């Protein structure tokens, strides 16, 4: 039927994690970029946005807004949300950690220059002492190739998306975490993700 | 019984109390009173990301509010009947979580920001959030947000209705279907009991 359509600015922001997820799952999708204040007004006036905000994803007859509502739908539909409620609970806990750390990095562009370098220090500290250790530990708990249930899930995709942003921020941060290093390699070589990393894909660049 | 590890306040764990109580589920609380109570949780390995809320439930130690709430809603059949209903539920409650996060962080706002933040909240309540939920109720005439049956969304929206009433009781006044939902849901036996003096429901912060 209808390809999904994704409505956002031509940038990573809040739609990037959905592009990764769809691309990871081998699903073809279309984008519709918001060029101006008037394009977003058009969306609002046409009643396309429940809460007057994008990201919005037109998919299977719905106009889903809220990143988490979109991700959750795509994850279940393409069997990347684990095989049962308990598995979904581990996935949720992992990905919400990832979302929290992600949020910090995503917002660092719009810090006050006053606060910026304590905020960066604070981030780097959480990564090294909080986040990378918890996942390294998960990976080391089972020695398996994926974070949950010994098969590809959304957790692996969101984690690896984040490991790319961490690299850009400071490529030394991951160096004392070998299992994370290996996870990043393995996931980046999966056909669909190798293609998404290749030039020409919907993958978006860092902002300028 | 599930066991909820938090401070003896609303914060990020009150939505879980509402949900469990709404689902007629008994739970325990183990309150964190000293910085050292929190140390022990950390050193014992109870917290994946070093933070509470944490719920010990069905033999897991779930942290993160969304993960805890996701598991409960499914387990007690308050997460609709299929993926498409779950996606509408998701959309609704994440909007509710966005408004709630703004109201939740208000006490800890730098004082010089407080006034503007409160006015931006009321403006968002009036023009963005309440109309959107009134719209949904109006479109189907049903007693429930989704599926014509009680769901987590109804529960989460009504909890937020109580917080908005605390902030300013005039804000709901031009939204009659929201007012009606608030009444209907507060009258469900489990919610009516939660709302009665003596339940694990927590007070606003000092």
Helix, strand, coil shares, percent, chain B, to 5: 55, 10, 35
Q: Is A73 on the interface with B (CB under 8 A)?
A: yes
DSSP string, B142-184: -SSSSTTS--HHHHHHHHHHHHHHHH-TTTTTT-HHHHHHHHH
Question: Do A158 and A105 share a structural domain?
Answer: yes
| CB neighbourhood size of B84 (10 A) | 17
Q: Do A170 and A125 share a structural domain?
A: yes
Q: Do B64 and A134 touch (CB under 8 A)?
A: no
Q: Is A51 on the interface with B (CB under 8 A)?
A: yes
Query: Same domain, yes or no, for A99 and A8?
Result: no
Q: Which residues of B touch A97 (CB under 8 A)?
A: 48-49, 64
Residue pair A60/B84 in contact by the 8 Å Cβ criterion:
yes
**Pair B71, B57: CB distance under 8 Å:** yes
Would the annotation count B136 as a binding residue? no
A175 and A115 fall within a common domain: yes
Could you tell me if A30 and A3 are in contact, meaning their C-beta atoms sit under 8 angstroms apart? yes
Nearest CA-CA distance, residue B196 and chain A, Å: 31
* Structural domain for B67, as ranges: 1-78+188-206
The answer to whether B66 is a known ligand-binding residue is no
B90 closest CB neighbour out of A66, A85, A93: A66
Query: In this complex, is the C-beta atom of A122 within 8 Å of any C-beta atom belonging to chain B?
Result: no
Q: Which of B63, B68, B59, B65 is nearest to B38 (CA)?
A: B63
Q: Does A97 touch chain B (CB under 8 A)?
A: yes
Answer whether B49 sits within 8 Å of A76, measured CB to CB. no
Q: Does B95 touch chain A (CB under 8 A)?
A: yes
Quote the tokens at residue A111. 């810090």
Look at residues B43, B42, B39, B74 and name the one whose alpha carbon lies nearest to residue B58.
B74
Regarding whether A89 and A167 lie in a shared domain, the answer is yes
> CA B104 to CA B187: how far, in whole Å?
25
Question: What resolution does the deposited structure have, in angstroms?
Answer: 1.9
Check whether residue A71 and residue A92 sit in a common domain.
no
- Structure-block tokens of residue B126: 């009036």
Omega of the bond prior to B53 within 30 degrees of 0, cis?
Answer: yes
Tell me the CATH number at B118.
Answer: 1.20.1050.10
Task: Please indicate, yes or no, whether residues A95 and A178 belong to a single structural domain of this protein.
Answer: yes
**Could A92 and B75 be called an inter-chain contact, meaning their C-beta atoms sit closer than 8 Å?**
no
Burial of residue A3, with CB atoms counted within 10 A of its CB: 0-12 exposed, 13-18 middle, 19 or more buried:
exposed
**What is the domain count for chain A?**
2
Q: Considering only alpha carbons, which residue of chain B is nearest residue A87?
A: B71
Q: Token digits for B91?
A: 């959309």
* Both tokens assigned to A51: 């809460």
> For residue B111, how many other CB atoms are within 10 A of its CB?
6
> Measured between alpha carbons, how far is B19 from B204 in angstroms, rounded to an integer?
18
Q: What is residue A52's DSSP assignment?
A: S
Indicate if A29 and A68 belong to the same structural domain: yes
A194 touching B (Cβ < 8 Å): no
Taking the C-alpha atoms of residue A153 and residue A88, their distance in angstroms, rounded to an integer, is 10
């Amino acid at each position: 039927a209808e390809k999904p359509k994704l409505h956002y600015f031509n940038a990573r922001g809040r739609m990037e994690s959905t592009r990764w997820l769809l691309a990871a799952a081998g699903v073809e999708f279309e984008e519709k970029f918001i060029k101006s204040a008037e394009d977003l007004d058009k969306l609002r006036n046409d009643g396309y946005l429940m809460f007057q905000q994008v990201p919005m994803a037109e998919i299977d007859g719905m106009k889903l807004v809220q990143t988490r509502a979109i991700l959750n739908y795509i994850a279940s539909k393409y069997n990347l949300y684990g095989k049962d409620i308990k598995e979904r609970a581990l996935i949720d806990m992992y990905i919400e950690g990832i979302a929290d750390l992600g949020e910090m990095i995503l917002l660092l562009p719009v810090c006050p220059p006053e606060e910026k370098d304590a905020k960066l220090a604070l981030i780097k500290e959480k990564i090294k002492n909080r986040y990378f250790p918890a996942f390294e530990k998960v990976l080391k708990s089972h020695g398996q190739d994926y974070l949950v249930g010994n098969k590809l899930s959304r957790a692996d995709i969101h984690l690896v998306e984040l490991l790319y942003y961490v690299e850009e921020l400071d490529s030394s941060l991951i160096s004392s975490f070998p299992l994370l290093k290996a996870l990043k390699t393995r996931i980046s070589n999966l056909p669909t993700v190798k293609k998404f990393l290749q030039p020409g894909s919907p993958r978006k660049p860092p902002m300028d």
